[PDB]
Design a protein around this ligand. Structure first.
Ligand SMILES: Cc1nnc(-c2ccccc2OCc2ccccc2)[nH]1
Length: 113
């Protein structure tokens, strides 16, 4: 019934949408932690100090780690920022991040208050 609970329900709804089949064609690079070694990205952890991905956001939501919508939004935006920091801006994965961030920002803006 409380404001923070209602806002976190909205956040959980957004999280479910970002993980849904509707967005899977561009969301899939953000499903799991970047496996830098497996992808040959041996500079990844020198450039990205705070990795973030949607499985980590889901674990934190399930564990009641997020106390408010702003904390949730900070992790989702960190995930996008990491992609924009690491990758040249004309790379495919950046286009995919920008499309998923459009989904995120437009729905986040509909936060109940
Ligand atoms: C998240 C994330 N941020 N950067 C990457 C990434 C960077 C370089 C190479 C692969 C990469 O992720 C796998 C991938 C994505 C798109 C298309 C093909 C592979 N992934």
């Amino acid at each position: 019934m409380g404001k923070l609970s209602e806002q976190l329900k909205h956040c959980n709804g957004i999280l479910k949408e970002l993980l849904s089949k509707k967005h899977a064609a561009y969301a899939w690079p953000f499903y799991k932690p970047v496996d830098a070694s497996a992808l040959g990205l041996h500079d990844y952890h020198d450039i990205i100090k705070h990795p973030m991905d949607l499985s980590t956001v889901k674990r934190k939501m399930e564990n009641r780690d997020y106390r408010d919508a702003q904390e949730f939004a900070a992790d989702v935006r960190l995930m996008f920022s990491n992609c924009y920091k690491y990758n040249p801006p004309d790379h495919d994965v950046v286009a995919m991040a920008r499309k998923l961030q459009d989904v995120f920002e437009f729905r986040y803006a509909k936060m109940p208050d």
